[PDB]
Structure 1
Amino acid sequence: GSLLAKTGQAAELGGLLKYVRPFLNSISKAKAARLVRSLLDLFLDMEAATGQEVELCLECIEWAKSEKRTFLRQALEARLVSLYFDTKRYQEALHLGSQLLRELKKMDDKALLVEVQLLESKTYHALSNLPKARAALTSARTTANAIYCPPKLQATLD
């Protein structure tokens, strides 16, 4: 995956991701999930196949749901909220963020909640929704008090 990212390959990386699934369902859930996240991010980095990225990640989310890896599928849902904001998606990003918030507040994840709230504030600002953006950002601060030194995340919040 590192060499594929260095060269800029897309089809080979997609095939490798679609192939490594048995190895994913054979090891620690957290390690496999983070490997999946890293591979997906590296694939989405360079080659901008906007007609394929969303569909591939949605297939990955459906696969994670079938594997009952709830935190994995939630992480990819947050990643697609980020990709939706990158692609200037109007309200589908919004309802995906709302669904993520509903699924996550019942849990006690914190990094995902901060990222989701920050993305919601970002998309409110993109749609020029200033008061809801302010409310979401205040909630983002209230949630982000938890992580003490997330050096990237604190810069994002600021």
Structure 2
Amino acid sequence: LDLFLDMEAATGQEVELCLECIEWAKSEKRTFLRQALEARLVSLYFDTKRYQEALHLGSQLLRELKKMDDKALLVEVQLLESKTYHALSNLPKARAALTSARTTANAIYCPPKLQATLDMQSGIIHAAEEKDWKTAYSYFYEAFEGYDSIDSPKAITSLKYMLLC
């Protein structure tokens, strides 16, 4: 699925075919599988800039994630929840989803793909209101510490964010 979506080809059948993946995964009753398929499909609607059903279906996914286990999966959807309220420019719900992902991910050693994205988005939250660029520069600096030597577009946009803030 991820290697099929990174090709960036024929995105019209991708979202419907992903709905056939959630349909098939529910047909064989694989709950965590279709939770992952919604977890990537909501990133597809984030890439499509369709903020209605991404926040709606993602929120209904939060209704079955707040009850269930796998707290690290909640960090993905509260992270991208912060991405979609920031993309809609809503600061308190982005700070609340951010802080909820922080107090969810405080016990879990996250991968630096997920661990650094908290502070990467957090610097855009604080320097979105431009409260303190010392703290925000700490967020893009530690974000650069997370994206160092793992991905070169992410690194050049990381130093773009350091020189930016």
Structure 2: gaps of 5 or more residues: 160-165
Q: Residue 42 in 1 paired to residue 44 in 2?
A: yes
What is residue 114 of structure 1 aligned with on the other side?
A: 116
Letter in 1 for 2:118: V
Question: What's the counterpart of residue 78 of structure 2?
Answer: 77
The equivalent residue for 2:139 is: 136
Q: Which amino acid aligns with 2:105?
A: L
Question: How many residue pairs end up in the alignment?
Answer: 151
- Secondary structure of 1:108 counterpart: coil
Moved over 4 A (4+): 12-18, 31-34
TM-score (structure 2 length as normaliser): 0.69
How big is each residue's C-alpha offset from its partner over 1:73-130, in whole Å with a ceiling of 9 and x where there is no partner? Answer: 2211111111111111122101211221222232111221201110010121211223
Displacement of 1:150 in angstroms is 2.6
C-alpha deviations, 1:7-52, integer Å up to 9, x for none? 2797x579657635535726xx6x766543322212332263x443
TM-score (norm 1): 0.72
Aligned to 1:123: 125
Q: Which residue of 1 aligns with 2:156?
A: 155
Q: What is the aligned partner in structure 1 of residue 23 from structure 2?
A: 19
Out of 8, 11, 21, the position equivalent to 1:6 is 11
Identity of aligned residues (%): 11
* 2:69 partner SS: coil
The answer on whether the counterparts of 1:124 and 1:130 sit within 8 Å (CA) in structure 2 is yes
Higher RCO, Cα 8 Å, sep 6+: 1
Which 5+ residue runs of structure 1 have no aligned equivalent?
Answer: none
Query: Quick one: structure 1 residues 140 and 53, their matched pair in 2 at CA, closer, same or farther if it must change by over 3 Å?
Result: same
Between the aligned partners of 1:61 and 1:135, the Cα distance in structure 2 is: 30
